[PDB]
Amino acid sequence: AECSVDIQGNDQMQFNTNAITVDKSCKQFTVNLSHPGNLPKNVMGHNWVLSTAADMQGVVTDGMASGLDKDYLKPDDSRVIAHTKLIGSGEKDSVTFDVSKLKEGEQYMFFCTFPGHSALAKGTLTLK
Amino acid sequence: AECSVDIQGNDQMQFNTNAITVDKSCKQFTVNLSHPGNLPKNVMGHNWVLSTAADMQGVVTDGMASGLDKDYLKPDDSRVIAHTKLIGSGEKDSVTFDVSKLKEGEQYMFFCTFPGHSALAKGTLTLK
Amino acid sequence: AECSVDIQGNDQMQFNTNAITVDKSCKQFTVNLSHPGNLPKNVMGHNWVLSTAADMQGVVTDGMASGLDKDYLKPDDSRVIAHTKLIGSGEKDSVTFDVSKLKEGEQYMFFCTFPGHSALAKGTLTLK
Amino acid sequence: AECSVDIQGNDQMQFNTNAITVDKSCKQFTVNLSHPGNLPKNVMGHNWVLSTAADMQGVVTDGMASGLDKDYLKPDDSRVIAHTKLIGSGEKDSVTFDVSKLKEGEQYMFFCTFPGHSALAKGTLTLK
Lengths: 128, 128, 128, 128
Ligand SMILES: [Cu+2]
Ligand SMILES: [Cu+2]
Ligand SMILES: [Cu+2]
Ligand SMILES: [Cu+2]
What we know:
The structure is a homotetramer of 128-residue chains.
Chain A: E1 4-8, E2 19-22, E3 28-34, H1 41-44, E4 49-52, H2 56-64, E5 82-83, E6 92-98, E7 108-111, E8 122-127
Parallel strand pairs in A: 1-3, 2-8
Antiparallel strand pairs in A: 3-6, 4-5, 4-7, 7-8
The structure holds copper (II) ion (4 copies).
One copper (II) ion (CU) binds next to loops of chain B.
Domain Plastocyanin-like (chains A, B, C, D): 1-128
Pfam family, one (chains A, B, C, D): Copper-bind
InterPro entries (chains A, B, C, D): Azurin, BlueCu_1, BlueCu_1_BS, Cu-binding_ET, Cupredoxin
């Protein structure tokens, strides 16, 4: 509530929400991710990455090839509007970003870049 | 909250939740399912089916064998605790079941049986 | 292997391959598609659509709007480099294309345009 | 074809097949597994475990609890009919079993027990 959202990635690779509504009146928007489970980073690590539905696929392919020290994200990926760290069981991670990096008339996708998870852990973000 | 749940399945095959908690004092429990999108039942229909985590894959395999006229649920499946019918977008359906068919301790999966969707349209139900 | 590849889309909405590699010494490349399941193409149809990684989302969204009768592909779409027809279990379709249309350094993604199938029925294709 | 199939787990967490049919004329059936991508065993290793459609939840649960060191498989698990070792890209493994351990009319699921992979890396097996 306000200009933030608390989201969870479980051991079953599913976020607890498929949709995030960003109110255009927010100057900044924060996402507080938690990985409630028992599995660790290297096996079920989850990050929350934000891209345009159109770049997502390249973000994902590239992120896969970047490894864990990279959090499965390509360093200095212009396509990545925002992201948290790859966390694991019990760790938390927040991210704050400028809402002005977002424009209406665009479809944004949030997902996780850990190899193979994007197929299940993803959703939509809209500026309304 | 209390003794009902309203859930939505959308056009990307995801349920709006992946955890349902049934209070042990509800005599009955009602699951209200709706389908937001723009897609027809034969292409993107959902149903909500409840079964033990054990029976889920057999109910899911026997379901697509049953075809669209059977809501992709074998009829009289003994492993199905409760189910709605397959709804296309624009539709809705409620199912009201007896809380005495569930034992605490035991694990339950809710899911969709439409061909290949249970891979993403699934979650857990807990008597609490 | 050679200058052609056999691909299968099944009843679970998955392709047997998620990575293809075209040898530069191939003038053309042939994709032979089949559908090893039991379901109809109005329920579980599959096509093989080739676009760049960047254009995938557009072709898919534009494609799901043109419905069945148009094989879920927007006609005369300029992002589609090559495609098959939508087939059902039991059907077949191959498409030969010009390798000269691919360029080294670009990221191509193959997918199926049927509603929701690209969630798993997708893969990368690269020149080599 | 004949009394064996070649299966393959990739970097997307999928098998090239989700349906196996063991003919009643096979005295032994063989599964040759492979891992066509390039991620390692600790990130994306996969195995091939056969059990009844009924026993799959548990094998999988006791298995992800056992650890990589144990091929994520409960040592001396009874519900497991056959299985290979966990392989990473580049590696191969095979398992041959007697068709006598299987019966007609019963439903089996082949799968991978590496944490979370059975969500997609799963299939059916029937003696025909
Ligand atoms: Cu994840
Ligand atoms: Cu569904
Ligand atoms: Cu398809
Ligand atoms: Cu695996």
